[PDB]
Design a binder for this molecule. Structure first.
Ligand SMILES: Cc1cccc(Nc2ccccc2)c1
Length: 120
């Protein structure tokens, strides 16, 4: 979990984290635990035209998966959210978390966010 971004949620406005939450919640549409498992994650990706495999998906979850549960919950999602929209490490040091299927902040969000999305 990028503690830089982990601060950035601490740095996001109320609206900021509120919006992002929704995407989490809809990422977990009908989920029993309501945390994003790999196929919960994969759902949205396929909602975006992606077609991951859990392996890929897991590495996305694994970042913030502090409990080692294989599921992202809100703040876990949220820090990736601000991570996704910032990702300032363009041409310098960063560790690769599988450039397999990279979900875009808004593009992914919009898939869930047919409710308060910038687009639809
Ligand atoms: C490469 C990488 C690292 C961390 C997170 C994600 N994406 C993601 C998006 C939504 C839910 C879970 C994960 C991708």
């Amino acid at each position: 979990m990028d503690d830089i971004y982990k601060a950035a949620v601490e740095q996001l406005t109320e609206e900021q984290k509120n919006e992002f939450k929704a995407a989490f919640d809809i990422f977990v549409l009908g989920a029993e635990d309501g945390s994003i498992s790999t196929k919960e994650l994969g759902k949205v990706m396929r909602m975006l035209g992606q077609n991951p495999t859990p392996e890929e998906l897991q590495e996305m979850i694994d970042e913030v998966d502090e409990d080692g549960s294989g599921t992202v919950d809100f703040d876990e999602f949220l820090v990736m959210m601000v991570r996704s929209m910032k990702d300032d490490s363009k041409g310098k040091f960063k560790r690769p978390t599988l450039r397999r299927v990279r979900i875009s902040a808004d593009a992914m969000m919009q898939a869930l966010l047919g409710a308060r999305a910038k687009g639809h």
